[PDB]
Amino acid sequence: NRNILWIMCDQLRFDYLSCYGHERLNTPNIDKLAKRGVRFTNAYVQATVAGPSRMSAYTGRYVRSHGSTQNGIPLRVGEPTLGDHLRDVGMRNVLIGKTHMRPDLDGMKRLGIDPDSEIGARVGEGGFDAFDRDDGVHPTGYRKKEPAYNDYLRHAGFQAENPWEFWANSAEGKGGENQSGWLLTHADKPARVPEEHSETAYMTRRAMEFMEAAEKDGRPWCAHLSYIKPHWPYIVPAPYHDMFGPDDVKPAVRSDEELKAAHPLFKAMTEEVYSRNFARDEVREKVIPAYMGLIKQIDDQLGQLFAFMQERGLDENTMIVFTADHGDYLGDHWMGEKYLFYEAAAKVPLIIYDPSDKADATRGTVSDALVEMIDLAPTFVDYAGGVPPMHILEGKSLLPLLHDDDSSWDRQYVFSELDYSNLPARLKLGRDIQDCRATMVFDGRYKLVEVMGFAPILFDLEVDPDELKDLGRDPSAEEVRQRLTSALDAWHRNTRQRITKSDAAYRALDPVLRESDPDLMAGVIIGYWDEDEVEAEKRRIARILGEN
Amino acid sequence: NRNILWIMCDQLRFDYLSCYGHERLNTPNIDKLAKRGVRFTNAYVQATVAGPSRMSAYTGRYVRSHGSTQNGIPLRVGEPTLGDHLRDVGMRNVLIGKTHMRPDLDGMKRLGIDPDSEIGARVGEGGFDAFDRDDGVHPTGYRKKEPAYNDYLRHAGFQAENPWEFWANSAEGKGGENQSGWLLTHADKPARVPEEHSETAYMTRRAMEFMEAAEKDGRPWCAHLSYIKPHWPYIVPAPYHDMFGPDDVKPAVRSDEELKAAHPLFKAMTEEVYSRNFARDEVREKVIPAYMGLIKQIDDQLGQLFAFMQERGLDENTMIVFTADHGDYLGDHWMGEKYLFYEAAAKVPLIIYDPSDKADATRGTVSDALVEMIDLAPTFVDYAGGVPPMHILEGKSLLPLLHDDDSSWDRQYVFSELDYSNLPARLKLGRDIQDCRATMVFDGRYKLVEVMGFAPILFDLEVDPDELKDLGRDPSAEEVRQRLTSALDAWHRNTRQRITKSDAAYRALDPVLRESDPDLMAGVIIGYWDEDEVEAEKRRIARILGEN
Ligand SMILES: [Zn+2]
Ligand SMILES: [Zn+2]
């Protein structure tokens, strides 16, 4: 069997891995994946927020296609998913961790699908077999299925009304006061929970447990190990909470001038509470060391996972992908969170290690090919031995980039989308709910964001790598604006909604379509004067079919 | 109860009704609908071919949304339909005649939906309760469910291998030879079948039978009486086959010059066998009198239907719509069939008679409002007492045009689409299968068709009502081209894929979104420094909720 382990971390910046240049945070286990595989430096997500980014990852389709545009918007019933495509070629699609899926209960009810049936559960899980579904954010008192992690904590002797919140995501003060990890001021406090029982440790162990169980199921698998960290709450168990400090924190990338007459959508984002707080040096210096500790814990735990795989021979037959759903500003551009399309939000780490001999020639290399998160789906289908259905999947298999040391890659532009109708910006910018649209196009140098109702945003990342000089209204950038806008015009038109007939289904008939009339083959006779005319054409059809 | 009777005829030109100006074909029963209702002179279909036009009619969504782009491409499982929206407000959606639906068997199989279950059958029928499903074209030897019409003929004493073909759509020569109605040369021959047992007579009677049965079901209904005629086979029972002759046939609208350096897509269409034959005066003179006879039979039969409704009081509470799925060139523009977007193909008759008092002020009037076939779905939901879901339905309810003698109508452009990958034009124009795109935009005067890979087609219907002078490459038309292309650019971007959350679902939270942080309401705490900051914001939320 050839398997796939798809590792994702939520809200992980590409530049917080040492293989992508971080000077103070050593991630040797993740770096080793890159040393033996391919590291991608132009990988972009198709939205920069958890839900829509992940819906694109799990469908291989743009947000403009699937329509799950914001956190919590259910993925429509009947939307094809990666799980469907892998099942079609005999590979399991299994989840250990987060997807941010919300079931289309209304759509299922219409179709009489019991949401708790085998089919219904899988539809609600976005085409995943949920070994351990856990989106990693469980405030009191969220209403959903209890994450297995809560019962795990209780069984391990950690009792609470909300074990996830109290034990894994809060600290206890020197006096006994409760220090909620929801609060940025407590990023420096050690979580109550011992490291071995923390979320990242738990989920890593669950992945090991899955692999053990899967080995004597016998079927090939694609396992999505999807970590919530380093997404907030920004709090980590000892010894990771005091491993780093303010001196390890790289400077914020921002300027006073970039705020002057800023694009209205950008201005609105800087006004949110997370942005105002991450604007403060005191906040960055306290929170970012926790973020770094969370990533270090992931790297340590992946070391355990990879050792486990090696000792069971899984290292020889399992392709490993390491990536993120989007980044985190942590104060860059005067923002917190991950809205808009600056590098820190929209560019993700992407490392792929295929242990197959076919990938030998590219080991330890760096690809600057324009790559999208939606490329993973066809990559996986291709790896699994199937022909990716390109009337449904909108991306490109990455296998040629792993398997050819000098392959031709025809993508000229990557794209990403934001529907901001659930943000205060909708009201501040005076937009109707359906009219809060922003779309990024990037060609490797120029990044343009079209914002409906407004001027575009434009950066030249060669001259202005920190994206501090918006050229959206600059007369000197007219030619670039026109080219990138034309790319957007074509992209909006390049739909893949014709999902119930493949291109392949047209081709066998082409010799008859070229010279004759395929309708006659079914006895449908359109535009013929007399019997002689019909029969003469039927003889031409017979001749053509004889030639082919 | 308030009901709806939605009458459609397949391949019926708007100008072959006397109320739209035909000088030789009197359609008094259809004209009477117009005399007591509203007749629309700018109604356009969203594709000009049966399948995709109808899929748009039955979903209220553009082809670019639903993806059923050609005849026979199944409508995807999970695509919302008119039947769903009517059911949500307690109105039945019943079919008597043609839909051109093809079940998404693959999609249903994935979801474990038995195609023969109650839910499965309805999904396969595009959201219709199929009282009598019959697409009206049954060549030997099509493979599908036997139309009820065949058993009807057999029971009436008309036996044959294929009763539809032999009796309803063929003639017997003076010597006894079989004269197939598939052949244009037999358009002048009377069908074997007596008029009372012909397709149009049969389907009209079936509609009466439905209405009788429905009356003591008690539930309000929308009944789609969907005639195959005057679509081919172009053959009709006596006495309709010799009611008209060559002298009644209006001149073809075409010119030698329009063919000179014609747009490549147009040129390709003129090369098809139906186009080459309808180019001949001999063919027009033989076929068009049959087409006229078929329409006369429809008008006579509708007279019977309306009398039946009046004698049962259904005339008082049933809105009647009369329309078509597209037209027929019959030799106009050197074409047969209905491809491309010339008036004869893309503009449909549309008459709506609402017997409610609310429609009194507009009776007998003519509306030149820009109207689309996709407007019928929200019109019907609105009439049925529901709020049309505009995150799903892409058109506009027409009720304001019926109920206000001077209402504001904000549509500036209508749109229609063609995917020509199933035509020889794909090969002749050198296009990939996904790249055979043409989209019409019309503003009431100018009609532009963008054709991917080629120059646009452009007509000014005020100066050039016959669409003989293509301005697509004319420098004098630059401003018009830019305006209409910008309308297309916006239309391609104006998607409605976010079908699992309504706009209404956003609004209750807006006072909190405007001033505060809705996430705190669920205990999700993003970007807050300390407990004081969180609690102060929670108090602001409480204040806001108290104000509203
Ligand atoms: Zn995320
Ligand atoms: Zn039709």
mmCIF file of C-alpha atoms in Angstrom, chain A residues 32-231:
data_model
loop_
_atom_site.group_PDB
_atom_site.id
_atom_site.type_symbol
_atom_site.label_atom_id
_atom_site.label_comp_id
_atom_site.label_asym_id
_atom_site.label_seq_id
_atom_site.Cartn_x
_atom_site.Cartn_y
_atom_site.Cartn_z
ATOM 1 C CA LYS A 32 14.086 17.142 7.950
ATOM 2 C CA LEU A 33 10.938 16.591 5.865
ATOM 3 C CA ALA A 34 12.123 19.449 3.677
ATOM 4 C CA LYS A 35 15.691 18.099 3.584
ATOM 5 C CA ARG A 36 14.405 14.857 2.046
ATOM 6 C CA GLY A 37 11.549 16.357 0.021
ATOM 7 C CA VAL A 38 10.392 19.536 -1.697
ATOM 8 C CA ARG A 39 9.758 22.842 0.073
ATOM 9 C CA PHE A 40 7.397 25.249 -1.693
ATOM 10 C CA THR A 41 7.898 29.012 -1.463
ATOM 11 C CA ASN A 42 4.849 30.217 -3.457
ATOM 12 C CA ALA A 43 1.999 28.196 -1.923
ATOM 13 C CA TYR A 44 -1.208 30.180 -1.403
ATOM 14 C CA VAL A 45 -4.515 29.319 0.250
ATOM 15 C CA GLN A 46 -7.810 30.020 -1.530
ATOM 16 C CA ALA A 47 -9.175 31.920 1.463
ATOM 17 C CA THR A 48 -7.232 33.100 4.501
ATOM 18 C CA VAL A 49 -9.748 32.075 7.155
ATOM 19 C CA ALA A 50 -10.215 28.597 8.594
ATOM 20 C CA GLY A 51 -13.612 27.551 7.258
ATOM 21 C CA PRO A 52 -13.460 28.638 3.640
ATOM 22 C CA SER A 53 -9.753 27.800 3.331
ATOM 23 C CA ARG A 54 -10.434 24.270 4.552
ATOM 24 C CA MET A 55 -13.561 23.837 2.431
ATOM 25 C CA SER A 56 -11.380 24.624 -0.588
ATOM 26 C CA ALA A 57 -8.688 22.204 0.648
ATOM 27 C CA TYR A 58 -11.235 19.407 1.114
ATOM 28 C CA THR A 59 -13.027 19.929 -2.213
ATOM 29 C CA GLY A 60 -10.145 21.068 -4.421
ATOM 30 C CA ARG A 61 -12.523 23.844 -5.527
ATOM 31 C CA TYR A 62 -12.404 27.646 -5.195
ATOM 32 C CA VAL A 63 -14.762 29.390 -2.785
ATOM 33 C CA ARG A 64 -16.501 30.895 -5.834
ATOM 34 C CA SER A 65 -17.407 27.291 -6.725
ATOM 35 C CA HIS A 66 -18.313 25.635 -3.419
ATOM 36 C CA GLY A 67 -19.993 28.621 -1.750
ATOM 37 C CA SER A 68 -18.942 27.903 1.841
ATOM 38 C CA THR A 69 -17.604 31.423 2.120
ATOM 39 C CA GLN A 70 -17.248 31.974 5.888
ATOM 40 C CA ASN A 71 -16.737 30.104 9.127
ATOM 41 C CA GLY A 72 -19.796 28.060 9.992
ATOM 42 C CA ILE A 73 -21.469 28.156 6.575
ATOM 43 C CA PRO A 74 -22.345 24.523 5.857
ATOM 44 C CA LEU A 75 -20.767 22.897 2.832
ATOM 45 C CA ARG A 76 -23.717 22.128 0.567
ATOM 46 C CA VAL A 77 -24.935 18.551 0.323
ATOM 47 C CA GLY A 78 -23.859 17.078 -2.999
ATOM 48 C CA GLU A 79 -20.675 19.118 -3.305
ATOM 49 C CA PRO A 80 -18.021 16.564 -4.343
ATOM 50 C CA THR A 81 -15.190 16.148 -1.828
ATOM 51 C CA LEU A 82 -11.709 14.696 -1.724
ATOM 52 C CA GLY A 83 -13.100 11.747 0.232
ATOM 53 C CA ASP A 84 -15.367 10.887 -2.710
ATOM 54 C CA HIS A 85 -12.491 11.005 -5.177
ATOM 55 C CA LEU A 86 -10.199 8.906 -2.990
ATOM 56 C CA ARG A 87 -12.944 6.361 -2.325
ATOM 57 C CA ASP A 88 -13.414 6.023 -6.094
ATOM 58 C CA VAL A 89 -9.839 4.764 -6.327
ATOM 59 C CA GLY A 90 -9.910 2.644 -3.170
ATOM 60 C CA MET A 91 -8.180 4.934 -0.675
ATOM 61 C CA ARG A 92 -9.636 5.821 2.719
ATOM 62 C CA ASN A 93 -9.953 9.465 3.781
ATOM 63 C CA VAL A 94 -9.547 9.645 7.559
ATOM 64 C CA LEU A 95 -9.586 12.625 9.951
ATOM 65 C CA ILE A 96 -7.582 13.061 13.153
ATOM 66 C CA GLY A 97 -8.291 16.615 14.313
ATOM 67 C CA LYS A 98 -9.895 19.744 12.845
ATOM 68 C CA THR A 99 -11.898 20.370 9.668
ATOM 69 C CA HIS A 100 -14.292 23.184 10.607
ATOM 70 C CA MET A 101 -17.009 21.276 8.734
ATOM 71 C CA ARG A 102 -20.613 22.157 9.440
ATOM 72 C CA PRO A 103 -23.235 19.687 8.195
ATOM 73 C CA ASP A 104 -25.765 20.881 5.631
ATOM 74 C CA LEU A 105 -28.657 19.701 7.771
ATOM 75 C CA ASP A 106 -31.275 21.466 5.634
ATOM 76 C CA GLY A 107 -29.922 19.918 2.438
ATOM 77 C CA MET A 108 -29.777 16.472 4.002
ATOM 78 C CA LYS A 109 -33.321 16.780 5.356
ATOM 79 C CA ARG A 110 -34.601 17.580 1.871
ATOM 80 C CA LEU A 111 -32.963 14.413 0.562
ATOM 81 C CA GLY A 112 -34.140 12.259 3.473
ATOM 82 C CA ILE A 113 -30.573 11.598 4.580
ATOM 83 C CA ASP A 114 -30.362 10.744 8.272
ATOM 84 C CA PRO A 115 -27.501 12.912 9.551
ATOM 85 C CA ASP A 116 -26.537 10.024 11.855
ATOM 86 C CA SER A 117 -26.576 7.297 9.202
ATOM 87 C CA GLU A 118 -23.263 6.073 7.794
ATOM 88 C CA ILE A 119 -23.745 8.167 4.662
ATOM 89 C CA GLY A 120 -25.154 11.124 6.587
ATOM 90 C CA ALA A 121 -22.298 11.210 9.075
ATOM 91 C CA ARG A 122 -19.732 11.154 6.275
ATOM 92 C CA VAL A 123 -21.534 13.928 4.366
ATOM 93 C CA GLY A 124 -21.614 16.006 7.543
ATOM 94 C CA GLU A 125 -17.902 15.354 8.058
ATOM 95 C CA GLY A 126 -17.076 16.622 4.575
ATOM 96 C CA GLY A 127 -16.183 13.217 3.153
ATOM 97 C CA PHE A 128 -13.938 12.192 6.071
ATOM 98 C CA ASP A 129 -14.073 9.043 8.179
ATOM 99 C CA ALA A 130 -13.820 10.838 11.530
ATOM 100 C CA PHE A 131 -11.389 8.803 13.649
ATOM 101 C CA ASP A 132 -11.251 11.807 15.995
ATOM 102 C CA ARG A 133 -13.137 14.940 14.912
ATOM 103 C CA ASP A 134 -12.061 17.886 17.062
ATOM 104 C CA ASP A 135 -11.980 21.494 15.909
ATOM 105 C CA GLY A 136 -10.022 22.449 19.030
ATOM 106 C CA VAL A 137 -12.114 25.384 20.238
ATOM 107 C CA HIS A 138 -14.656 24.539 22.921
ATOM 108 C CA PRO A 139 -15.830 27.525 24.956
ATOM 109 C CA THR A 140 -18.359 27.066 27.708
ATOM 110 C CA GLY A 141 -20.855 26.369 26.664
ATOM 111 C CA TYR A 142 -20.598 25.410 22.999
ATOM 112 C CA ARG A 143 -23.359 23.139 21.756
ATOM 113 C CA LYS A 144 -22.026 20.202 19.776
ATOM 114 C CA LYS A 145 -20.790 16.661 20.236
ATOM 115 C CA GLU A 146 -18.374 16.407 23.143
ATOM 116 C CA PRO A 147 -14.841 16.145 21.742
ATOM 117 C CA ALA A 148 -13.233 12.829 22.641
ATOM 118 C CA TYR A 149 -10.442 14.918 24.226
ATOM 119 C CA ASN A 150 -12.717 15.973 27.107
ATOM 120 C CA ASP A 151 -13.434 12.365 28.075
ATOM 121 C CA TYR A 152 -9.741 11.598 27.625
ATOM 122 C CA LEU A 153 -8.884 14.286 30.187
ATOM 123 C CA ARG A 154 -11.546 13.055 32.619
ATOM 124 C CA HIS A 155 -10.351 9.460 32.315
ATOM 125 C CA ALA A 156 -6.805 10.675 32.984
ATOM 126 C CA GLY A 157 -8.034 12.253 36.227
ATOM 127 C CA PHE A 158 -8.527 15.852 35.118
ATOM 128 C CA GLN A 159 -12.064 16.840 36.077
ATOM 129 C CA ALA A 160 -13.798 20.131 35.282
ATOM 130 C CA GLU A 161 -17.031 21.535 33.900
ATOM 131 C CA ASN A 162 -15.023 22.172 30.729
ATOM 132 C CA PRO A 163 -11.813 20.104 30.753
ATOM 133 C CA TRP A 164 -10.558 21.541 27.441
ATOM 134 C CA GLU A 165 -10.873 25.077 28.773
ATOM 135 C CA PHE A 166 -9.887 24.573 32.409
ATOM 136 C CA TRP A 167 -7.017 22.119 31.971
ATOM 137 C CA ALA A 168 -5.667 22.485 28.451
ATOM 138 C CA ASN A 169 -6.331 26.188 27.931
ATOM 139 C CA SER A 170 -6.070 27.885 31.314
ATOM 140 C CA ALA A 171 -3.484 28.321 34.043
ATOM 141 C CA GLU A 172 -3.669 28.579 37.816
ATOM 142 C CA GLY A 173 -2.046 31.568 39.484
ATOM 143 C CA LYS A 174 0.466 31.434 42.332
ATOM 144 C CA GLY A 175 -2.447 32.168 44.662
ATOM 145 C CA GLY A 176 -4.919 29.785 43.046
ATOM 146 C CA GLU A 177 -6.788 32.256 40.867
ATOM 147 C CA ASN A 178 -8.016 31.055 37.492
ATOM 148 C CA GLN A 179 -5.994 32.454 34.606
ATOM 149 C CA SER A 180 -8.003 32.021 31.427
ATOM 150 C CA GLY A 181 -5.922 31.209 28.353
ATOM 151 C CA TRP A 182 -8.471 33.055 26.251
ATOM 152 C CA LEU A 183 -6.729 36.193 27.530
ATOM 153 C CA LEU A 184 -3.583 37.451 25.794
ATOM 154 C CA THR A 185 -2.097 38.525 29.136
ATOM 155 C CA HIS A 186 -1.871 34.839 30.094
ATOM 156 C CA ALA A 187 0.158 33.724 27.080
ATOM 157 C CA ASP A 188 3.160 33.533 29.465
ATOM 158 C CA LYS A 189 1.436 31.159 31.910
ATOM 159 C CA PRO A 190 1.866 27.381 31.771
ATOM 160 C CA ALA A 191 -1.355 25.494 30.989
ATOM 161 C CA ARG A 192 -2.589 23.428 33.969
ATOM 162 C CA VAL A 193 -2.410 20.209 31.950
ATOM 163 C CA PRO A 194 0.802 18.156 31.910
ATOM 164 C CA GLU A 195 2.422 18.200 28.450
ATOM 165 C CA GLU A 196 1.700 14.519 27.798
ATOM 166 C CA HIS A 197 -2.041 15.195 28.076
ATOM 167 C CA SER A 198 -2.140 18.462 26.147
ATOM 168 C CA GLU A 199 -3.986 18.832 22.835
ATOM 169 C CA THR A 200 -0.989 18.491 20.527
ATOM 170 C CA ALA A 201 0.341 15.469 22.431
ATOM 171 C CA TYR A 202 -3.118 13.874 22.483
ATOM 172 C CA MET A 203 -3.746 14.319 18.779
ATOM 173 C CA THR A 204 -0.296 13.006 17.841
ATOM 174 C CA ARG A 205 -0.968 9.875 19.884
ATOM 175 C CA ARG A 206 -4.387 9.502 18.249
ATOM 176 C CA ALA A 207 -2.665 9.541 14.855
ATOM 177 C CA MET A 208 -0.391 6.710 16.033
ATOM 178 C CA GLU A 209 -3.422 4.785 17.261
ATOM 179 C CA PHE A 210 -5.096 5.258 13.893
ATOM 180 C CA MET A 211 -2.045 3.996 12.018
ATOM 181 C CA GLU A 212 -1.879 0.877 14.183
ATOM 182 C CA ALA A 213 -5.562 0.145 13.593
ATOM 183 C CA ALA A 214 -5.315 0.917 9.873
ATOM 184 C CA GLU A 215 -2.363 -1.420 9.292
ATOM 185 C CA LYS A 216 -4.526 -4.521 9.620
ATOM 186 C CA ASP A 217 -7.532 -3.003 7.939
ATOM 187 C CA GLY A 218 -5.353 -3.353 4.873
ATOM 188 C CA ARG A 219 -6.819 -0.548 2.787
ATOM 189 C CA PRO A 220 -4.578 2.327 1.665
ATOM 190 C CA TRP A 221 -5.280 5.565 3.526
ATOM 191 C CA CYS A 222 -4.973 9.316 3.409
ATOM 192 C CA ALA A 223 -4.858 10.481 7.031
ATOM 193 C CA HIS A 224 -5.391 14.165 7.781
ATOM 194 C CA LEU A 225 -3.605 14.971 11.040
ATOM 195 C CA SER A 226 -5.006 18.409 11.602
ATOM 196 C CA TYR A 227 -3.634 20.268 14.625
ATOM 197 C CA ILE A 228 -5.484 23.215 16.143
ATOM 198 C CA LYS A 229 -2.269 24.765 17.491
ATOM 199 C CA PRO A 230 -0.732 27.323 17.080
ATOM 200 C CA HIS A 231 -4.224 28.865 16.669
#
